[PDB]
Design a protein around this nucleic acid. Structure first.
Lengths: 305, 108, 333, 333
RNA sequence: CUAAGAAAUUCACGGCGGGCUUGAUGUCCGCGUCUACCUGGUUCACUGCCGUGUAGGCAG
């Protein structure tokens, strides 16, 4: 809804012990709501104090390492846990399962405010790096500086500045630093297209998001029906199952100065695609928008194709 | 909850199929007048228990261990959010995944 | 005033997953191209060794149970046969702002908490807690079983301010014991650094590398994984070791549990040594909880007496509850 | 007073995996660049040699089974055709502090156990146990089948104090028998070194090298792995030998089991010879438990009589109980 | 302001017993690779002399 004036690249963020489950239906990559919450908390901590606003996230996931295991007689997988401390009587704990993982991801952040006006690009990028190297991303700690001495500094790249051919060339030289991974986009239109062409047989919607992202083996007309890209389930957002509540009327709230609601998880389809397949680098930015008249608390990436 | 009396949950569907006792016992217990099989005391007790079975809590209560989350607003403050575990939804997709992974059609 | 319904402290002293490598002694200055210690599998055959029930003494039944062989597959990790030194490396970041919770429902309670921890820093600095943290970094307490019976353990700490090193510390980890807390000028300077990082006066980043001189081809001890059992299924591999990118590793929480082993003020004894700090301070090896709530020395009642009732406890118990604040937790009803 | 629910002892006498290499006799002093013994594969056609069911002893069925024999692929390890001597090398650390468990519940039980072990050390040292351990190092009992039918076995033991050799022992491992425990000056010096290691009065690390003169191209016997399934997708592989990187090897528990073969006090006999110290001391090759719990001479009843009811057994059985403590294990409910 | 905030898996172990994979065999007919070029244009930073000199110049 807002075209960013420039783009900042959080180059190679290493993350240990991040949350893997992130949803009651998926277990793989964490939800993009975590990345939108990260850029909003970074806007709170260092973004306001520089006449800068931050809007959305592009994520590419250079590497993934889940703490899982296959239990030796089944094709499924289980989660690896940790030993919690003993109870007050010293008997044992109550085992609640959590899924940890390790991530290597880059972040693409858009800016609209006085970017190059009040401050130069290098000092802005350096203090955003120093700020983000003290917090956590998705439940797990941002792993600090190691013998990766090369990939440290960012690149605050002006989006619309320069010639349009020069714009394509500098965004291509920025995509040159993001080739190892594959970016993530929302695929609501392809979901709706397969939903309408499936509804000739039966009018159901979650069975589509089941049948979109598995290995469908069709018999002899032994073949495998296939989608052209990497189709994954993603948590599409938040839909409220209860009306608006005031800060004080609900007990055990996080804050008695913020209104509360009871919510359910919207699930959708995402897509991992090579970053060279998109020509404008501002297409990948995941924005979260609220429609508080109803329950729709949505994260997506509009203006993508 | 912690109620081990699952016989009431069984009797909610024991007369629910083909009878209006298991379906009207929660509200509009006019079929519960014959559903009690007795005078007004047993029918009133059955209607009160059926009304108290599926009764909503009303007064909301979060917890420390309930995943309270901030969500930003369009150009303003924040909203607090507490996701519930979609037990009916995960049971529906668990039945679908058991029908996909197991079952005689999938075996054939 | 009352305690808040929600109360959540983010942890400080975030460690990394400590990775293992191997090499020779007196090459440890050039220990950057040292190859990783890998995790292999092997086969074990054992016998009946546990206690038998009194109904199962039965020598024919015991001889029948012996003649069925007992085999397992076991994850193992060893040094190479030409390397005698294990090198364990992790990074530790100190953040500061230890008083502020990540969540609090009551505003007046969090303001009383903030002025309480502000008065605590005003009365004295973090230097006792920071000195004990620098002690647990000085002796290699994070080498859990890799330190037991080692010949010579030596710890290097690099404070990295910019992209290069800002300062280095060199410690003989066997001279500094695991029982008592000494005072040393390099150790007090490191204590001043961790204290200044804890006070919010900066962001401290350290790289800790420990060299243990074990022996040629000897067994090292990384972390073990948790596999919940597939009970009505086939037999599983009954040991799994933690590895990060085909390198034997210790968990981050294991190094964190080793770091906060500072509590020498638990009421049961003082000669058994320091324990880790937690509410109802309980060590999993002993299976028994010191700082029971029936005495007024656990973390929760001490915090309620300091904040709600304005009964400031003794200064070692103030150290204990401040260390529980640095450790973090999810506290509440 | 009762025994603790959890109680675990970490092992003293940690050996490494023994690696095999090959060379010529009388070059064994220059046996540092001896090439490793490699594990190869070969084809084996299996004949019919089992006992028949006698419901299948019909001659036509027997000839029909003989006409179609089955075939396997088998891992094998031989010496080279020009080398006649097998060299087997490992390292062994003696740690000390054998009484202290690594896990306990009861404080009174571990205090009573600690003073029981302390009184055992005060009555006599570790001299008998370390004498028998030095004997099992002197004869090359850790060469399990490689010792059988050897022409000459020689063991070189090096106490390694700093990164260089502190002391050297040279043993004719066939002169020192496998049956009885003799007395020798160098063997008693080695026993005193192992006893000083076991008492915590030093850090003992030994390099043990064994040379067996077997013959040109002869088959050596490394440790043997475990095969769960076998099919045509493999080479119908039915035997897998253990190997570190690229070398035939022996499991560390195999060397450890041949180290603690010291138990000559089992009540059945003594003319057979020593067995390995186990709770209900059992031999897998014989399928039988010596020290049955029906008699009062297994480890658990002896330990419970010694610690709880203060019934100190005979000094032979005291040696047996303390040897079981040195071996380590999980003892409890 | 991130389904946020928090966490010690672990102690011990003998996989070895034994074996014949064998016999027998025809690879073979046929073929157009051509056309046209500045590499070195200071990349040969040398050799010796005066000068105590490494400081500085000289001669081809």
């Amino acid at each position: 809804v807002t075209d960013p004036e420039a783009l900042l690249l959080l180059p190679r963020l290493s993350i240990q012990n991040a949350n893997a489950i992130s949803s009651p239906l998926t277990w793989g990559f964490p939800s993009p709501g975590a990345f939108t919450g990260f850029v909003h908390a970074l806007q709170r901590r260092v973004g306001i104090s520089l006449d800068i606003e931050l809007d959305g996230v592009g994520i590419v996931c250079h590497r993934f390492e889940a703490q899982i295991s296959q239990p030796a007689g089944k094709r499924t997988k289980v989660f690896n846990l940790t030993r919690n401390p003993l109870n007050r009587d010293g008997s044992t704990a109550a085992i609640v399962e959590e899924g940890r993982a390790h991530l290597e991801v880059s972040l693409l952040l858009g800016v609209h405010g006085d970017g190059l006006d009040d401050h130069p690009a290098q000092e802005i990028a350096r203090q955003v790096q120093e700020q983000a190297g003290a917090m956590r991303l998705a439940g797990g700690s941002i792993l600090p500086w190691c013998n990766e001495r090369f990939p440290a500094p960012n690149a605050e790249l002006l989006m619309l500045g320069g010639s349009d051919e020069q714009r394509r060339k500098n965004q291509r030289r920025l995509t040159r630093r993001l080739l190892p991974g594959f970016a993530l986009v929302s695929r609501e239109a392809l979901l709706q297209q397969h939903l309408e062409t499936l509804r000739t047989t039966l009018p159901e919607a979650t069975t589509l998001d089941a049948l979109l992202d598995l290995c469908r083996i069709n018999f002899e007309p032994w073949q495998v029906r296939d989608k052209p890209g990497w189709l994954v389930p993603i948590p599409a957002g938040y839909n409220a199952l209860s009306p608006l509540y005031l800060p004080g009327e609900v007990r055990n709230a996080r804050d008695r100065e913020t209104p509360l609601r009871f919510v359910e998880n919207l699930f959708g389809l995402g897509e991992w695609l090579s970053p060279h397949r998109v020509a404008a680098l501002s297409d990948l930015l995941w924005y979260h928008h609220a429609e508080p008249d109803k329950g729709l608390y949505r994260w997506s990436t509009p203006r993508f194709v | 909850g912690n109620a081990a009396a699952l016989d009431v949950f069984k009797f909610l569907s024991l007369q629910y199929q083909g009878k209006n006792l298991l379906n009207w016992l929660t509200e509009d217990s006019a079929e519960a007048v014959q559903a009690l099989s007795d005078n007004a005391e047993q029918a009133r007790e059955w209607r009160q228990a059926f009304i108290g079975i599926t009764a909503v809590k009303g007064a909301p209560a979060s917890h420390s261990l309930a995943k309270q989350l901030y969500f930003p607003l369009p150009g303003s403050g924040y909203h607090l959010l507490a996701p519930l575990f979609p037990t009916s939804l995960v049971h529906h997709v668990h039945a679908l995944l058991r029908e996909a992974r197991f079952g005689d059609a999938a075996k054939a | 005033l009352s305690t808040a319904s929600v109360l959540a402290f983010e942890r400080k002293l975030d460690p990394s997953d400590a990775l293992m490598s191997a090499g020779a002694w007196a090459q440890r200055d050039a220990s950057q191209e040292w190859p990783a210690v890998t995790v292999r599998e092997k086969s074990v055959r054992g016998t009946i060794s546990n206690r038998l029930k009194t109904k199962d003494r039965d020598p024919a039944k015991l001889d029948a149970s012996i003649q069925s062989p007992n085999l397992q597959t076991v994850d193992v990790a060893n040094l190479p046969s030409d390397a005698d030194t294990l090198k364990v490396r992790f990074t530790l970041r100190v953040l500061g702002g230890a008083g502020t919770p990540s969540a609090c429902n009551d505003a007046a309670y969090r303001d009383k908490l903030l002025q309480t921890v502000a008065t605590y820093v005003n009365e004295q600095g973090f230097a006792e807690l920071a000195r004990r943290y620098a002690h647990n970094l000085a002796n290699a307490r994070f080498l859990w079983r890799n330190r037991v019976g080692a010949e010579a353990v030596e710890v290097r700490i690099n404070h990295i301010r910019q992209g290069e090193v800002a300062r280095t510390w060199r410690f003989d980890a066997l001279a500094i014991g695991l029982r008592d807390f000494k005072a040393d000028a390099e150790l007090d300077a490191l204590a001043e650094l961790i204290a200044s990082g804890l006070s919010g006066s900066g962001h401290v980043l350290l790289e800790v590398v420990a060299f243990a001189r074990i022996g040629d081809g000897q067994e090292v001890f990384p972390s073990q994984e948790l596999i919940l059992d597939k009970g009505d299924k086939k037999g599983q591999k009954s040991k799994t070791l933690y590895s990060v990118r085909d390198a034997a590793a210790i968990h981050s929480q294991k190094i964190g549990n080793a770091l906060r082993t500072i509590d020498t003020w638990y009421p049961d004894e003082d000669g058994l040594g320091p324990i880790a700090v937690e509410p109802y301070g309980s060590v999993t090896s002993q299976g028994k909880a010191y700082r029971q709530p029936k005495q007024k020395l656990d973390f929760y009642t001490l915090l309620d007496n300091w904040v709600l009732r304005d009964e400031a406890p003794a200064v070692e118990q103030q150290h204990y509850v401040i260390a529980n604040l640095i450790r973090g937790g999810v506290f509440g009803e």
